[PDB]
Amino acid sequence: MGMKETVSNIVTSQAEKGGVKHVYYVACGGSYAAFYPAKAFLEKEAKALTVGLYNSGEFINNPPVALGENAVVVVASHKGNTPETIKAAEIARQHGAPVIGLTWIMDSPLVAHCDYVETYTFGDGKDIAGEKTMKGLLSAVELLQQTEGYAHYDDFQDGVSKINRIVWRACEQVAERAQAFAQEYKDDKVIYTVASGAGYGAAYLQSICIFMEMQWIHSACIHSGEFFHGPFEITDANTPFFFQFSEGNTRAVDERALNFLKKYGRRIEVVDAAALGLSTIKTTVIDYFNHSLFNNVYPVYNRALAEAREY
C-alpha cells in the first residue's frame, strides 16, 4: 500500500528525536501543483502536524527554521534531474530531516539524495490508484494515520480502490462532448479556469495546458470563492471559462460561482465530478479525489482541441 512501509520506517527512526511534527512538500512545475491535494489534506485533517508546500527554488533559498529532525520532506521530480529539487533533498538531509523522493526514473541523480524512493504509474494505461498525485496524498494519509490517527482511513482506502474505474469510465463518457468542445473553442486564444478546494491544483495545471495549446496569454486560474470579492473577469474580450465543478465540501462554493457566470451569459465548459461518477466515494474523503479525476479527464478535451487545430 502506497507509502505505508516508508512512513513506518520514518516514524520509527524519528521517535527518539521527538517524532514527526512537520511535513514539507517541495517541487517545481507540474510536481508542485500535484502536491496541493496533500497540503489540503493535512490542513483539513491534522491537529499535530504542520504542512508546507514549497517551490524548490524558494525552499532552498529560504528554508523554514522547523526544518530538522522533527520534519519530513517529500520531494518530487519526474525525471529526477531538477537541480533545485535535488538541492532541496540535500539541504533537508544536512538538517537531519528524512527525505522521501518521488520519481519515475529510479537511477536518477535525485535518488542519491533521498532516504527513501517511491515511484508511481505513468503514461499508457496508467492505474490512477498508483499515480504520482495519489502517492503524494498517500504520504499525507499515512503520516497522519501513523502519528495522530486518521478517523477516515478506511473510507480513504475505499476511495483509492474505486478511483481508477471512475476515471477511465469518465474518459469514455466525455469523448463526444470533447469533440464538440473542440469545435466551439478552436479559435479561442485565451480560456480561464475556475476551481476551489483540494482539486484546485488540477485547474492550475489545466491553465498551463490551455496556454501550451493556444500559445497566446497565460491567463488566471480563478478561485471560485474570489469572484464576489474582486473585479469580475467579464470584459469585452469575451474570454470563456473552463469550469471545474467539484464534489464535496467546496461544491457549494463552486455552485455559487457557476450560477453567477450563467447570469452573465458567459461561455462556460463545465466538467462536473458529480456527473462523472465520483459520488460513489464516501463524502468523508471525496474532496481529495477531485484532482485525480479532473487531471486525468482534461486530456480528452485537450487532445480533441489540438486535433481541431515538467510533470
**Which residues line the annotated binding site for Mg(2+)?**
226, 229, 231
Using the structure block, give the residue that is written with the C-alpha cell 485537450: 302
Minimum separation from the CB atom of position 30 to a second copy (A)? 8
From first CA to last CA, the distance across the chain in angstroms is 23
306 touches a second copy by CB under 8 A? no
Among 104, 153, 168, 211, binds a second copy (CB under 8 A): 211
208 touches a second copy by CB under 8 A? yes
128, 134 Cβ separation under 8 angstroms: yes
How many residues sit in the footprint of a second copy (CB under 8 A)?
61
Nearer to a second copy, 123 or 231 (CB): 231
**Cα–Cα distance between 227 and 302 in angstroms, integer?**
26
Among 236, 259, 263, 265, binds a second copy (CB under 8 A): 236
User: Among candidates 106, 121, 139, which has minimal Cα distance to 24?
Assistant: 139
Among 250, 290, 292, 302, binds a second copy (CB under 8 A): 250
**Cα–Cα distance between 82 and 85 in angstroms, integer?**
5
Residue 130 makes CB contacts below 8 A (sequence gap 6+) with 2, 120, 121
Chain positions 52 to 81 lying near a second copy, rule: CB under 8 A, are: 52, 55-58, 61-62, 64-66, 70
218 touches a second copy by CB under 8 A? yes
Rounded to the nearest 10 degrees, the angle between the axes of helix 290-308 and helix 36-45 is 160
**Which one-letter amino acid corresponds to residue 46?**
A
1 touches a second copy by CB under 8 A? no
149 touches a second copy by CB under 8 A? no
134, 102 Cβ separation under 8 angstroms: no
Three cell numbers written together for 287: 474532496
Minimum separation from the CB atom of position 101 to a second copy (A)? 17
Among 1, 112, 180, 237, binds a second copy (CB under 8 A): 237
120, 136 Cβ separation under 8 angstroms: no
45 touches a second copy by CB under 8 A? yes
- Please enumerate, by residue number, every residue annotated as part of a binding site: 226, 229, 231
293, 248 Cβ separation under 8 angstroms: no
Q: Which residues bind a second copy (CB under 8 A)?
A: 21, 28-30, 32, 43-48, 50, 52, 55-58, 61-62, 64-66, 70, 82, 84, 190, 192, 196-197, 207-208, 211-212, 215-220, 222-226, 228-231, 233, 235-237, 239, 248-250, 252-253, 256, 287, 310
